[PDB]
From Swiss-Prot, chain A:
Component of the mitochondrial ribosome large subunit (39S) which comprises a 16S rRNA and about 50 distinct proteins. Interacts with OXA1L. GO terms for biological process: mitochondrial translation; translation. Keywords: Mitochondrion, Ribonucleoprotein, Ribosomal protein, Transit peptide. GO terms for molecular function: rRNA binding; structural constituent of ribosome. This is Large ribosomal subunit protein bL20m. Belongs to the bacterial ribosomal protein bL20 family. It is found in: Mitochondrion. Its main location: mitochondrion. The gene is Mrpl20. InterPro entries: Ribosomal_bL20, Ribosomal_protein_bL20_C. It comes from Mus musculus. Pfam families: Ribosomal_L20 (PF00453). It comes from the Eukaryota. GO terms for cellular component: mitochondrial inner membrane; mitochondrial large ribosomal subunit; mitochondrial ribosome; mitochondrion.
Swiss-Prot record, chain D:
This is Large ribosomal subunit protein mL63. Identified only in the intact 55S subunit. It is unknown whether it belongs to the 28S or to the 39S subunit. May localize at the subunit interface and dissociate from the 55S mitoribosome during subunit separation. One of its GO terms (biological process) is translation. The keyword Phosphoprotein does not apply. Disulfide bonds: none annotated. It comes from the Eukaryota. Its main location: mitochondrion. It comes from Mus musculus (Mouse). GO terms for molecular function: structural constituent of ribosome. Belongs to the mitochondrion-specific ribosomal protein mL63 family. The keyword Ribosomal protein applies. One of its GO terms (cellular component) is mitochondrial ribosome.
From Swiss-Prot, chain F:
The keyword Ribonucleoprotein applies. GO terms for biological process: mitochondrial translation. It is found in: Mitochondrion. It comes from the Eukaryota. Belongs to the mitochondrion-specific ribosomal protein mL49 family. One of its GO terms (molecular function) is structural constituent of ribosome. The gene is Mrpl49. This is Large ribosomal subunit protein mL49. GO terms for cellular component: mitochondrial inner membrane; mitochondrial large ribosomal subunit; mitochondrial ribosome; mitochondrion. The keyword Ribosomal protein applies. Component of the mitochondrial ribosome large subunit (39S) which comprises a 16S rRNA and about 50 distinct proteins. Interacts with OXA1L. Keywords: Mitochondrion, Ribonucleoprotein, Ribosomal protein.
Curated annotation (Swiss-Prot), chain G:
It is found in: Mitochondrion. Belongs to the bacterial ribosomal protein bL35 family. One of its GO terms (molecular function) is structural constituent of ribosome. One of its GO terms (cellular component) is mitochondrial large ribosomal subunit. This is Large ribosomal subunit protein bL35m. It comes from Mus musculus. The lineage of its organism: Eukaryota, Metazoa, Chordata, Craniata, Vertebrata. The keyword Nucleus does not apply. GO terms for biological process: mitochondrial translation. Its main location: mitochondrion.
Length: 140, 97, 58, 78, 166, 66, 95
RNA sequence: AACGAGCUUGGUGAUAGCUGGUUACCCAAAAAAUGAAUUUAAGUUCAAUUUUAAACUUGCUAAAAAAACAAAAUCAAAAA
RNA sequence: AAGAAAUUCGUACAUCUAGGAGCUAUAGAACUAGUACCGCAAGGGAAAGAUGAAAGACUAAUUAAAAGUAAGAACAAGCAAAGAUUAAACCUUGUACCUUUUGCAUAAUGAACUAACUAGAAAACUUCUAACUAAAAGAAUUACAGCUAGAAACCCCGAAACCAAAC
């Protein structure tokens, strides 16, 4: 036995420290703990991407609740704000509804009015003056 | 795994004992001595591998030539069996032909 | 020349400072790791993996 | 099967784009003969660069400085 | 083998100051090699947990198991040393804080079967541990009342926060 | 080397090896039509050139009188 | 073949190669044509002429024949009056 | 206690084109598994593929007419 | 596959009664022993020990340290975890591992768990690094830039059989 590995104690502890919060023999038996830890790491990596998608669904759900209190569907509210050159994202809109109820109501009226202007422009045909809020500022 | 619960006793090495101090002296006996002696003649070891090197099969066959006739019965039986095993490995087995 | 002047500045040459010429030694590879382990470069089960392919010229 | 409404529309939109692709490819600025030779000089120069790189391989210089700098590993405060 | 239960009796604290509650006494005792299974001894050790010395000795005297007699003798020696060596005033003023069983060193033998076969037999042994603490047994458990259950429920509702937002 | 790479070597150089490189490039450049590819080894004091130019270099060195 | 012999520990030459081929010092090998003495009566005059020639070997055959012979068969030989004196070298070869 | 041929030691690390196994990390590239011979088809050798290094110069897509075919595979000018 | 001789060379450490980039209780001898035990016989053939200067000082200590248990049974829902969360469980996402198969498995082999042990080895040719160079090598060899030296390589376990001599 000329040369023998003298570090096996610390190589074992690297795996087992990640398994202390498991239940069963998975938290103390190396041949079992090693299989469980790698499955956990794979799940951890795939859940970094899925987290971002989940939060967007939460934002859209809460926005629909806030708009419907004022009689608006989600597609109408979001689309018309864009046509008014408002570039607030969904994450910040949720903050206003929860924490700034009066400001959110003001935005609700603005989106509704722009929708009405579009309806009038559609039904009326020919050359007619454009809506007050339907004027687009230009950049160069 | 289980590890020592105490430190082993210290090892103290004298780097200036006679063997260490004079290592290498007379390695140039030939060039500085008019070539009366070759440096290989300064080597101490088994009779059959002084100033010579080879693979395991070559070492086994060389040992038999030098001291084969002065060996014990059982030692010689094992040496002969080792030769035949090495012969079949080196001449019939391996990745490369 | 100028090279010998450099020695004067540098620390003493000793048995703790030796170095070989660069690229004079290659690395020898053992079959322990995943790249060079497992099947160890011999392929799938057969005569050649086991080590008993016929002789040269056959 | 029954083809869904989405699938029918999405295909139509892609058809319309390809129709315009056909139109813009029908009005060549230069005829075939006028094209001949108009870019010969640039093309020839390009290969010369490629050939030069291919035939430029050679070992690298070696310096006394690299070898002697190893001795600084034993520098100290005296 | 480890023998730490024995040494627990030799701890010495510094003298208590006048303005401090009187520290109760503690006694540790065990019997080491016993020809009895530890699984069986567990049921006996479990029963006397939390009881006073007199109530424990009363229940043991009318149990039919072989382990009951061995536990009783260990209890009697613990009581004797408590008064004699650990400055306990009244014999009756004691209760069982801890009692448990442990595995001992065992022996391997052969058990015969019917076709020249055999099996491995174990002759099993066990330990017994106790700790005696001076004072009346601590009061028992009282289940949660209906009012107590509700108060927890409102506390849970009050702890809520708005999740994943500013 | 490799059975197809031809080279010429000047070996026992003392002093400034880099000065010799500049002279060789000037001397050989008009013949080739391009600057020759060279390697300088400072440790061994040798100069290596791509292609066979032994005869010209031998005559060139004699003129300088080494 | 024998990579390591018992008595000397060396490689051995395959003597059936030495009896059939000739090696030129550059690395080429020469041979005859199989059947050049068999049933000549049934062979055309052009066929028989092709058989009489000495022929070279391919790259893969040359590689195999080199492994099966030792270095002694690859040295320089200075035979007075050699009839192969002019074929031991190559000229004007870019390769 | 196990005889279509006893048991033990040695020859013996018998032989096995068949079954199972073959222990640190990182970077890079990569297959088809078509043709030929073989007591050969559970295996091997050669071509073909892939690959590392080196020398130096044209390649890939496209490709008019004019052929050869019979009434889309060859072939590859000039250009891009 | 096997394989000479003729003919050349060599007094060698030479008290080195000495040495180790050899092993340290699953290693090194099978060995504390050819004993205990097994077989009618030839024959096969193990396991393990640990205080201190003093026990004519009561046998010493040291270690959250393996699996296994105890202290302390359990609480709708699911490869047992991950994103999370004020909050252990509730909500969402997710068809155990190795080998082998057609790059596919809810197919089929193998694994009760812990500790130790347990499997790629050679220099003909090539490439890289140096010495000297029409010559290189410390005798015998190679040479139309060669020659000398260094570094770089090719596994483990498993039959039914056959032969010799004992019992
Ligand atoms: Mg998305
Ligand atoms: Mg190796
Ligand atoms: Mg049992
Ligand atoms: Mg085998
Ligand atoms: Mg095919
Ligand atoms: Mg046949
Ligand atoms: Mg086969
Ligand atoms: Mg062309
Ligand atoms: Mg002789
Ligand atoms: Mg032993
Ligand atoms: Mg033993
Ligand atoms: Mg434990
Ligand atoms: Mg669940
Ligand atoms: Mg089956
Ligand atoms: Mg199983
Ligand atoms: Mg292990």
């Amino acid at each position: 036995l000329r040369n023998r590995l003298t570090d096996r104690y610390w190589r074992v502890q690297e795996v087992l420290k990640h398994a202390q919060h498991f239940r069963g023999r998975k938290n103390r038996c190396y041949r079992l703990a090693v299989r469980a830890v790698t499955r956990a790491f794979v799940k951890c990596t795939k859940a970094r991407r899925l987290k971002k998608r989940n939060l967007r669904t939460l934002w859209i759900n809460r926005i629909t609740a806030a708009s419907q209190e004022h009689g608006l569907k989600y597609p109408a509210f979001i689309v018309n704000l864009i046509k008014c050159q408002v570039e607030l994202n969904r994450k910040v809109l949720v903050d206003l509804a929860i924490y700034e109820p009066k400001t959110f109501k003001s935005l609700a009226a603005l989106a509704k009015r722009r929708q009405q202007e579009g309806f009038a422009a559609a039904l009326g045909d020919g050359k007619e003056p454009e809506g007050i809020f339907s004027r687009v500022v230009q950049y160069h | 795994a289980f590890v020592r619960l105490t430190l082993p006793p210290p090892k103290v090495v004298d780097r200036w004992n006679e063997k260490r101090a004079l290592f290498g002296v007379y390695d140039n006996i030939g060039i500085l001595g008019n070539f009366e002696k070759h440096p290989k003649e300064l080597i101490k070891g088994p009779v059959w591998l002084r100033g010579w090197r080879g693979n395991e099969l070559q070492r086994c066959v060389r040992k038999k030539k030098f001291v084969g006739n002065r060996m014990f019965i059982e030692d010689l039986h094992n040496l002969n069996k080792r030769i035949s095993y090495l012969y079949k490995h080196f001449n019939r087995h391996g990745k490369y032909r | 020349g100028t090279s010998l002047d450099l020695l004067r500045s540098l620390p003493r040459v000793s048995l703790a400072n030796l170095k070989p010429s660069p690229n004079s030694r290659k690395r020898e590879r053992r079959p322990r790791d995943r790249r060079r382990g497992r099947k160890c470069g011999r392929g799938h089960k057969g005569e050649r993996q086991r080590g008993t392919r016929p002789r040269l010229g056959f | 099967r029954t083809v869904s409404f989405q699938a029918k529309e999405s295909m139509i939109r892609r058809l319309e784009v390809e129709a315009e692709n056909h139109y813009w490819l029908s009005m060549p600025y230069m005829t075939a003969e006028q094209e001949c030779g108009h870019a010969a000089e640039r093309r020839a120069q390009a290969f010369e660069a490629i050939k030069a790189a291919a035939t430029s391989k050679f070992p690298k210089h070696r310096y006394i400085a690299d070898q002697l700098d190893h001795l600084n590993i034993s520098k100290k405060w005296s | 083998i480890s023998r730490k239960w024995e040494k627990k009796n030799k701890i010495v604290y510094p003298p208590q100051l006048p303005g401090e509650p009187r520290r109760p006494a503690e006694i540790y005792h065990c019997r080491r090699q016993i020809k009895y299974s530890k699984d069986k001894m567990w049921y006996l050790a479990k029963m006397i947990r939390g009881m006073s010395i007199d109530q424990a000795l009363a229940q043991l005297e009318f149990n039919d198991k072989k382990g009951a007699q061995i536990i009783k003798e260990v209890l009697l020696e613990a009581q004797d040393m408590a008064v004699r060596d650990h400055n306990v005033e009244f014999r009756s003023n004691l209760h069982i804080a801890e009692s448990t069983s442990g595995r001992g060193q065992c022996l391997k033998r052969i058990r015969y079967h019917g076709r020249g076969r055999f099996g491995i037999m174990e002759k099993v042994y066990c330990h017994y541990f106790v700790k005696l603490v001076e004072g009346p047994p601590p009061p028992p458990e009282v289940p949660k009342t209906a009012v107590d259950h509700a108060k927890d429920y409102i506390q849970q509702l009050r702890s809520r926060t708005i999740i994943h937002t500013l | 080397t490799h059975g197809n790479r031809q080279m010429t070597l000047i070996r026992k150089v003392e002093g400034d090896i880099w000065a010799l490189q500049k002279d060789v490039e000037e001397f050989l450049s008009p013949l080739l039509g391009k600057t020759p590819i060279t390697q300088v080894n400072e440790v061994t004091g040798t100069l290596r050139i791509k292609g066979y130019f032994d005869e010209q270099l031998k005559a060139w060195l004699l003129e300088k009188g080494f | 073949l024998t990579y390591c012999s018992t008595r000397k520990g060396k490689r051995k030459t395959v003597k059936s190669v030495v009896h059939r081929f000739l090696r030129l010092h550059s690395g080429l090998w020469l041979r005859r044509k199989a059947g050049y003495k068999k049933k000549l009566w049934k062979k055309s005059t052009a066929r028989k002429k092709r058989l009489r020639e000495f022929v070279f070997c391919s790259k893969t055959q040359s590689k195999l024949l080199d492994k099966m012979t030792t270095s002694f068969w690859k040295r320089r030989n200075w035979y007075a009056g050699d009839p192969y004196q002019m074929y031991h070298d190559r000229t004007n070869l870019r390769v």
